[PDB]
Amino acid sequence: PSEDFVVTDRGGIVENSHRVHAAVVDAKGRLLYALGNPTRMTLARSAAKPAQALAILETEGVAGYGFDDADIALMCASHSSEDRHIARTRAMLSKIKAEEADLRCGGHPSLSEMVNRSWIKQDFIPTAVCSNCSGKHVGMLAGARAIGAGTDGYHLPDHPMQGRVKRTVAELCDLDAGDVEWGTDGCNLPTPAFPLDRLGRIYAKLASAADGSDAGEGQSTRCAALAHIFRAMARHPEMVAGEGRYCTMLMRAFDGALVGKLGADASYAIGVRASDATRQLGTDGALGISVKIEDGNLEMLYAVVTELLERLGIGSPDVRSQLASFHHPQRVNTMGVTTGGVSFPFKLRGSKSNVDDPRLA
Amino acid sequence: TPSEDFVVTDRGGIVENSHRVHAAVVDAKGRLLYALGNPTRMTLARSAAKPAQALAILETEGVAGYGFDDADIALMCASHSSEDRHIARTRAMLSKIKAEEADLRCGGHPSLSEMVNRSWIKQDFIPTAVCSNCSGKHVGMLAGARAIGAGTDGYHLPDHPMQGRVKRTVAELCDLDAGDVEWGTDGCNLPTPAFPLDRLGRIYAKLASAADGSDAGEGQSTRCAALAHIFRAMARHPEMVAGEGRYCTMLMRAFDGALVGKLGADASYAIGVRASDATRQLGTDGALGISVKIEDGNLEMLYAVVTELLERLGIGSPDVRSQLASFHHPQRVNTMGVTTGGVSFPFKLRGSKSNVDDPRLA
Numbered sequence: 137p138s139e140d141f142v143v144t145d146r147g148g149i150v151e152n153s154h155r156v157h158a159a160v161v162d163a164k165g166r167l168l169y170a171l172g173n174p175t176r177m178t179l180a181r182s183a184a185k186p187a188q189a190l191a192i193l194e195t196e197g198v199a200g201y202g203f204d205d206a207d208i209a210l211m212c213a214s215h216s217s218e219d220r221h222i223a224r225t226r227a228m229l230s231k232i233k234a235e236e237a238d239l240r241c242g243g244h245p246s247l248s249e250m251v252n253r254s255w256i257k258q259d260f261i262p263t264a265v266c267s268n269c270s271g272k273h274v275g276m277l278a279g280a281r282a283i284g285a286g287t288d289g290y291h292l293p294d295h296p297m298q299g300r301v302k303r304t305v306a307e308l309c310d311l312d313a314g315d316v317e318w319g320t321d322g323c324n325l326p327t328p329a330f331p332l333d334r335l336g337r338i339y340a341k342l343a344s345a346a347d348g349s350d351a352g353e354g355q356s357t358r359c360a361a362l363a364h365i366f367r368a369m370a371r372h373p374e375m376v377a378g379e380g381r382y383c384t385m386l387m388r389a390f391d392g393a394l395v396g397k398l399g400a401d402a403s404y405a406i407g408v409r410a411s412d413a414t415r416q417l418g419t420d421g422a423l424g425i426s427v428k429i430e431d432g433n434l435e436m437l438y439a440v441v442t443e444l445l446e447r448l449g450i451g452s453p454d455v456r457s458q459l460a461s462f463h464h465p466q467r468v469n470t471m472g473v474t475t476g477g478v479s480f481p482f483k484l485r486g487s488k489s490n491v492d493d494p495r496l497a
Numbered sequence: 498t499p500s501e502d503f504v505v506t507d508r509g510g511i512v513e514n515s516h517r518v519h520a521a522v523v524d525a526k527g528r529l530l531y532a533l534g535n536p537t538r539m540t541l542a543r544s545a546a547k548p549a550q551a552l553a554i555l556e557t558e559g560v561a562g563y564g565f566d567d568a569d570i571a572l573m574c575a576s577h578s579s580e581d582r583h584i585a586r587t588r589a590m591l592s593k594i595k596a597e598e599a600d601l602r603c604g605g606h607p608s609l610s611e612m613v614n615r616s617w618i619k620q621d622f623i624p625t626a627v628c629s630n631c632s633g634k635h636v637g638m639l640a641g642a643r644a645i646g647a648g649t650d651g652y653h654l655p656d657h658p659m660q661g662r663v664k665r666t667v668a669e670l671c672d673l674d675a676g677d678v679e680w681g682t683d684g685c686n687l688p689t690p691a692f693p694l695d696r697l698g699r700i701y702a703k704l705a706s707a708a709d710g711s712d713a714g715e716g717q718s719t720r721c722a723a724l725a726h727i728f729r730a731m732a733r734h735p736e737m738v739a740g741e742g743r744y745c746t747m748l749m750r751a752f753d754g755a756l757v758g759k760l761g762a763d764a765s766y767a768i769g770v771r772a773s774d775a776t777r778q779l780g781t782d783g784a785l786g787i788s789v790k791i792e793d794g795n796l797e798m799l800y801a802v803v804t805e806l807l808e809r810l811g812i813g814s815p816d817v818r819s820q821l822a823s824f825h826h827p828q829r830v831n832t833m834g835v836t837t838g839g840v841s842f843p844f845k846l847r848g849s850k851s852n853v854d855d856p857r858l859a
């Protein structure tokens with residue numbers, strides 16, 4: 137594996153450096169481009185959420201609860217805990233006739249500084265319904281009810297809802313159960329680790345499913361549901377994150393061409409629908425991108441992800457300029473003097489078919 | 498060829514994040530005794546340079562005249578939390594030199610303390626210059642500029658005579674030629690130096706050595722007396738150097754005068770340790786300096802590694818170091834109070850030749 141870094145400087149003097157791992161894969165998970173170790177065993181954290189939403193959506197009779205595309209986007213969310221997110225979470229609890237008291241996720245400081253500031257003013261202590269993963273938890277309760285397993289312990293790994301989740305994640309990764317490791321997340325659910333490239337493969341399968349559905353092609357019920365999750369995230373991107381959040385601004389910029397999702401401690405996944413851009417990357421289908429910053433730095437993650445989209449020619453300069461504040465983190469001191477910047481000396485490595493493209497592959 | 502030395506975090510035994518560690522442990526002459534990573538890494542010292550800047554201030558002819566006390570000198574050496582007491586002391590220091598807040602050329606920022614920020618956020622308080630974590634250093638630089646007769650205007654600019662004194666003093670404490678120290682601009686809008694990481698340790702060894710010389714009642718150069726004075730001000734006013742719940746403050750209170758420690762932004766740290774049974778056991782007959790950089794800049798990981806280093810080096814009793822356990826072993830507890838993982842130190846100290854294969858390295 138290569139020595140691929142994002143580097144910060146102060147007056148040209150190196151401040152911090154951050155090791156970058158990245159996989160770019162086709163609809164079958166074949167590796168097209170890489171940084172660092174693209175097979176790094178990686179906790180996907182919230183970037184696993186679409187796989188968890190598929191498990192929920194494949195549960196007999198969850199159709200019955202009348203979840204809309206905005207609700208599915210919230211199941212797929214690390215939301216900012218804005219009032220709209222809390223209100224959708226409550227409306228989802230009503231649709232399954234459950235109560236806040238059924239939630240086994242806990243409250244935390246908002247992922248949005250402006251939300252935190254609102255909460256600090258109101259001396260508000262966040263509760264379970266405020267969890268960035270609240271949507272997932274309501275989705276898991278819904279699954280738990282529909283299975284007839286009861287909602288008690290729906291979060292526990294031996295609950296049948298979690299056995300559906302583990303099985304679904306392994307299958308989307310094309311891995312044996314033994315190849316997927318499990319810990320416990322901040323929101324108190326089981327959370328998977330698998331090779332970084334397989335997160336890319338999950339998202340390439342979402343984008344691939346969207347293309348199959350749109351092409352009015354016949355589709356397995358699994359593929360139909362993946363198309364539905366893609367559409368839900370792309371068309372309700374504020375539900376997936378919130379105002380000023382990377383994921384939201386990324387998916388609004390791309391206006392349905394891709395979905396993207398943060399994982400805590402600096403993983404990211406994108407599924408890109410077949411396009412002129414993906415064709416020039418030497419695949420005729422959809423594409424998956426997965427990234428991990430080794431040290432967990434989110435600011436560096438969003439810079440690297442945006443740089444990779446630019447390097448890969450995904451969207452136009454004009455679409456990607458909506459993310460300029462993320463691409464090029466500001467280094468402006470307390471007196472408004474620019475003191476340095478962020479550089480990307482990493483160099484994409486290519487599959488054999490991409491080797492020696494001077495477009496730095 | 499520098500070692501692959503990491504602090505590693507896990508979730509259920511599964512690697513989450515890893516952070517590359519650089520560290521130097523040096524004697525009073527700056528000779529390297531132990532290392533992690535690249536002990537000579539060119540490193541922006543940021544706020545860890547503050548004792549050297551304070552020396553430039555205290556060696557300025559006539560600064561004595563203003564009657565700065567030890568708590569004031571600690572504030573010069575501070576990255577404070579912008580507690581009311583730090584803002585009050587900054588105003589008292591401006592009073593001693595008859596300057597106004599408007600003369601400061603640092604800007605306000607969100608407090609280094611979450612509790613202070615929450616207080617400010619609640620009162621929609623916009624922090625101003627006097628609130629800067631570097632406010633004490635800036636008042637000291639203004640004081641130096643005034644006493645030079647250069648005048649306070651442009652005191653912060655690299656070509657101002659006060660910054661000339663700073664740049665010379667930093668290179669001198671490092672035992673480096675001027676061209677071996679690089680300069681950028683800090684968050685507080687002052688020049689800020691970069692030099693090999695071991696020279697940060699060397700500065701802190703010299704602070705502690707000076708303190709030893711002073712307390713031994715040995716004859717000392719005016720510079721060594723000034724270094725001793727800085728050591729004493731930091732060790733005896735540790736709340737002024739940082740604040741409530743801050744690593745630097747808790748570390749220096751725990752050690753009760755045996756060492757000083759100081760953060761630099763983007764996760765550098767420096768400690769100067771007075772000659773002790775511990776330093777003797779480490780194979781040196783004088784004071785010791787420790788300098789650390791976390792390559793990716795993570796402060797939580799810096800405090801964990803620094804504390805782990807003091808433990809591996811036997812500096813302090815386990816009881817003294819236990820005051821820092823919350824920093825040493827960062828908690829990994831989820832929103833429902835379940836422990837989900839922790840932090841490991843699989844890095845391994847490398848020794849000078851006289852320290853090779855001491856099994857206490859691990």
Ligand SMILES: [Zn+2]
Nearest residue numbers: 269321323325
């Ligand atoms: Zn979660």
Ligand SMILES: [Zn+2]
Nearest residue numbers: 631683685687
């Ligand atoms: Zn400063």
